[PDB]
Every structure is written in C-alpha cells, then in structure tokens.
Design a protein around this nucleic acid. Sequence first.
RNA 1: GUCAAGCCGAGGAGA
RNA 2: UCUCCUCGGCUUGAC
Length: 683
Amino acid sequence: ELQLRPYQMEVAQPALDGKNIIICLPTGSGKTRVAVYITKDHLDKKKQASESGKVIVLVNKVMLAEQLFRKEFNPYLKKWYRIIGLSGDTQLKISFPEVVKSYDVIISTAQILENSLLNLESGDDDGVQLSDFSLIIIDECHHTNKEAVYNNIMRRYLKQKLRNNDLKKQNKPAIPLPQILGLTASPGVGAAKKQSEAEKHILNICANLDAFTIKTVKENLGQLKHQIKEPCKKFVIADDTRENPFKEKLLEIMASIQTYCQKSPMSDFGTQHYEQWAIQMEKKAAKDGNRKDRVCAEHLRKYNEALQINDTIRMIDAYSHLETFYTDEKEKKFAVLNSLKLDETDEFLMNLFFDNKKMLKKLAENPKYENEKLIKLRNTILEQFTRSEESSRGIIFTKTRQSTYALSQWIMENAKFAEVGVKAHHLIGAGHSSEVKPMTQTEQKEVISKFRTGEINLLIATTVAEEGLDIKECNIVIRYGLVTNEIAMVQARGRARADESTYVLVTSSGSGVTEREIVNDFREKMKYKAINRVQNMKPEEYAHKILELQVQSILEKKMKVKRSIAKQYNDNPSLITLLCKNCSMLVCSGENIHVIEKMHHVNMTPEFKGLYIVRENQTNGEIICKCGQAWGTMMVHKGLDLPCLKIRNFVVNFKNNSPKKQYKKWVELPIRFPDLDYSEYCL
RNA sequence: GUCAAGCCGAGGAGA
RNA sequence: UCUCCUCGGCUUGAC
Ligand SMILES: Nc1ncnc2c1ncn2[C@@H]1O[C@H](COP(=O)(O)OP(=O)(O)O)[C@@H](O)[C@H]1O
Ligand code: ALF
Ligand SMILES: [Zn+2]
C-alpha cells in the first residue's frame, strides 16, 4: 500500500540508482516516506541482482528511532523484509553486530554503530564494518560537522574512499563502499556573514557525506509549495518595569554581600557575564585557598541564577530555589555540629538571608508584578485554544528543564488554563540535572503517545523536541525567549502540520533576542541562494573542491590526534594531596585511592572514613564535609560500601610546588590511578 | 515494571 | 581557555 508524490519521485530519482546524495526539503514533506520508498526499491534491486541487501538508518535523537519504526518503516516494509529498531533504551540481548546480519533492515541511533566499529578497531569485540552494509541512510545530516558523531563515521568512509581511489590507479582490487544518502531540511550555515562563506559551509557538508549534489526539487517545486503551509508568524514582546518590590530587594541583598566582600563586579546583575565573573573569582579564591570570597562568589552565583529565573519565572520559583539551597546549607551545618562550632561568614549570610527570606516569601505571592513575558504567554495560549474549539495541539519550547516543570505546574494550577481544558505535561531528557526529576525513556515515549492521542494538547519540551516528533496535526507552536541558531528556529517553526498554523515568539524587549531572530531570518534567505549557486556548479569543479575538503577533514583529524596522542603523559600515582575546597582541609593522598570499572575514583581507608558525614534523604547516601562542603556519594560495589566522590568538589595540592588548580573531572588530569585488588578488606 | 548514582563523548549559546 | 545549557552513550547498584 506504499505511496509516493511527484516531487518525491523527482528529488529521489537520481538516488534510485547509485548517486550517493543528499536531499533538502522543508519539514513534513514526506521525507520519511521518501526514505522508505528508497529502502524498498534499493533492496528489491539487490535481490533481483542476487546481491545482499543491507540497510541501516541513523538518527541523532533517541525518540526519532522509535518514531520512524512505529509509523513509517515497520508498517509498509514489515511484510517484505525484516525490520528492527534499536536505542539506548532497547536491550540488545543479541548484540549489534549479529543483528546486522539478522533483520536486514536496521534502525539505530548513531553512536551505537560507532561504538561497534570502535570495538572492532580495538579487537575487543567482533564489531562491524561499513562493508557489511550496502546502503547507509541518515537524518538531520546538518549535524555532520567538526567533531559531530555522524562525522566520525563519514571520516572513516571517506578514508576508505580515498584508499579505493588510490588503488584505482595502482591495482584493480578495491573494497566496496556502501551508497550513502542524506536527508535534512536546513543544511545550515556556520554563522557566515558572507554568502560565499555559506556556500563553502555547504560544500563542506556535502563533502562530509560524499554528496554528489544537494538535489532539491525544482519542477514540482510549486506543487510542494502549494501543498505545504507556513504558519502565520507572530511576535510578542513585554517590558519588565515591574518586580521593583521583589527583584530590587534581591539586588539589595547582592550589594549587601558585595559590601561584605569589597569586590566590584563592574557588571550588571542577572547577566551571564556577571555569572562568569563570579566563577573566575570563585576559582581564584579557591586556588588561593582564601575564604570569604569563594563562598560568597558561590552564593552570588546562586543569586544571579535566582535573578534570571525570576526574570523569566516568578518570584516564587526563585525564592523557593534559594530557600532549598540555604536549607541544604543549614542541614550540613547541623550535621557538622552533631560538638560545638561557629562561623562568621556563614552566620553573616544566613542571618542576612533567613529574615529577608521571609520577606521575599511575603513578596513572592503577588499577581500584579508577577511577570510580563509569562503573562503574554498565557494570553497567547488562552486566545488560541479558545479560538480552536478542541482543535488545538500545542507545543512549547524553552532552554532549561526547571523551566519546563515550573510552567507545567503553574499552567495546571491556573484556573484559566483549567477552564479552557488544556492539559500540560513537561518533557525532558533521560539524564537527571537542573534539580529536576529525570524521565524514564518509557515515560517520554508514553507522553509522546498521549499527545499523539490528544490527551495532552500542550506539551512542554526542550531541544529534544526541536527535531522529529512527526505529528499528523499541530496548529500551535511558540518559543519562550530562546534563540540558538537558524536551524533550530526553522525546524521548530515547521512543526505545526496544519492548514492553519501559528508561530509565536516571546521575548523581553530589553534582550537583543528579536535581533538574533532577524539574524537567522537572513541566514535562511542566504542559504537557499547559496544552494542555487552550487546546484549550478560544474560537476568537475564541484568534485575537485569536495576532494580537497575530504582530505582537509581527515588531516585535521590526524592533528587533533597528534595533540591527543597522550598530550599529558604523567605516570605519577600519588604525587599530590587533596584538600577540601571550601575549607582547605586535607583529605587524602593519591596512594589511598583506587578504581573500579576503570571509571569511578574512590578511597576506602578508615582514615578517610572517620572524616565525612552522611546527610540523609535509603542506600545511596550523600557525603559532606566538616566545614559543610559536599564531597561525594556512597557506593555499594560488590558488597563493599565504598564511598565515591567527585574531584570537582576537592582541590589539588602537588608535593613539588603546589600550583593549586581545579580540573572539574578526573580524566582531564594526566596521572593514573590503579584498580583495587579486593585482596584487601578480608577478615 | 521501579529507582538511584556515577563516567565519557558531542553539539549549541555566551563570555 | 572558561562558563551555562542541551543531547547521546557506557557502567554500577538497589528496589
Ligand atoms: N505519498 C504521500 N502522500 C501524502 N502524504 C504523505 C506521503 N508521504 C508522506 N506523507 C506525509 O508526510 C508526513 C511525514 O513527514 P516527514 O517526512 O516524516 O516529516 P519531515 O519531512 O519533516 O521529516 C506524514 O504525516 C504523511 O501524512
Ligand atoms: F525530517 Al523533518 F522535520 F524535515 F523531521
Ligand atoms: Zn570542608
């Protein structure tokens, strides 16, 4: 029951036979269908050729793999060929390399494949080789770039093509290369002011893929334009003259502390540059071993955060955020006391805070000066849903997660949204961060299905949503004051697959966001022109340029290796001393340390044992200092109750000359630690 | 079916 | 070089 459209056939017509190429079309144009048709066509040809038919599909996003398998690939081609869909969530009970020769149609996230190849290179596993496949297919190719995943693969394929070309003039024998396909919407630009630079960027993309041409549709192009609708754009701006009662109270607190510090930011409060200054000051303070400065740097940073959320989010959210933090600090102090101890700074800060904290709590619940951009957002939602009369499938984007969760709660709480019957759910990535609850991959998938069901007419999400999530109908899409690049803008702007679609943006009049909007708009215009230039490029000249770029990429890789051969070759097990960071309290040396899984660094001596504290919530306990610094988390490996930690929380002190430093992660530093022989700790 | 923790890589933004 | 955010992956464990 497979189908096709005219332009679809037109654009793909070359690839139907050889011609490893790219395809560039607007969103929701049946790209997936194009791929599917090509898969079937490709295999049928291999079968009639009595030749092996293997295919593989690649998606950067995990959600996307399931999507394609669920809705497009598995349905049509189920009967003819075997199919299967893999992801981190999926369990490869078999293995990757085996199924490569089992289901004959693979769908996978990228890094899975690369992981397999890399293992093959190591010899640790049988792994897999490109030759095993006959056709490699890709989505969102635009990602292919400097150190992008896809690029890691292509650089291999390119290398082999170069070998094949070398043989072409030396020896008849060669190694087969699978046909490569490319599927995207906006190949994008590398922030090129000049369209010629953009042209170059494209050429780089194509060469990173052995694209013989962009091959965008021209003849039926009008038909496609007619078929496909573009949302009615809409800008929404809001100036923040309010927040004087509450925000200003905060700025007052910040200044009070800075006065406690005698440190001049020379930067506006609530800004990243201000935050960055806080960090470097904190780093310097800690490296110096000095206090009263790094600690305050920490708190101020917390407050700049609180400001930025208070800018977007209401006073309540930020106040709560500060309150949680200080609550944690108090609990640490109490655990330490559990003896007698006193502090001057912390006492200054907590007595500075707790009372003003009550004040801000009182100031927190105010509807009038709650926000401006949030309100505008409400107005847009309420208007559109009221206007749709049950015909609204809504999406939202932001930058962070804490944002998403807050919005979903506040929207559900708001009677106005409740009145219209809108239902809000927040979506995020699997990993846990930003002090938010992680979502199980299944939970995300469930949520997606519920929206596809319409159970949720308003799904909050993050960049993860910007891609894929092919939905039959969506009328509404917005952006909550977030500008990253033209590509993200267009993909998101191309997600309301409805005859009538609305694109909205919400920005502070003060922030130069609409600026960047216009930027990306120009880039969008620039690229289509650049594409038209190359499409008219000479084949041979095109060929020469791409070859040059292919080589360039590879040699670049070689040097990035050369500077990475070792680049920090210290075999110095214990030539150091780790102190606490808040307090300059010695903790351990390098010798008392060992490793498990060659990943986790730990010490397991009673000397380190009788120093920390376990703050409760129960198995995975958290660790803290006697100063109140947090140190690490418990760990139960093979029964051993080893407490593991994070290097970032501690500070370096060499034996030689003590140029104290921070590394933020173990791998960065040169020296090695050993694994732990469990011969120890026996009877 | 549930949860936690940790490590690594990559991209984007800003500086 | 630093920072923030985001994504992907790999391990350990417990329930
Ligand atoms: N032959 C066809 N005729 C009509 N509609 C089609 C055809 N093939 C695909 N589509 C439509 O295209 C949509 C899928 O678009 P897709 O290519 O996945 O989005 P994108 O191009 O942004 O990745 C489906 O909802 C389907 O309705
Ligand atoms: F391939 Al698309 F939006 F164009 F997922
Ligand atoms: Zn300490």
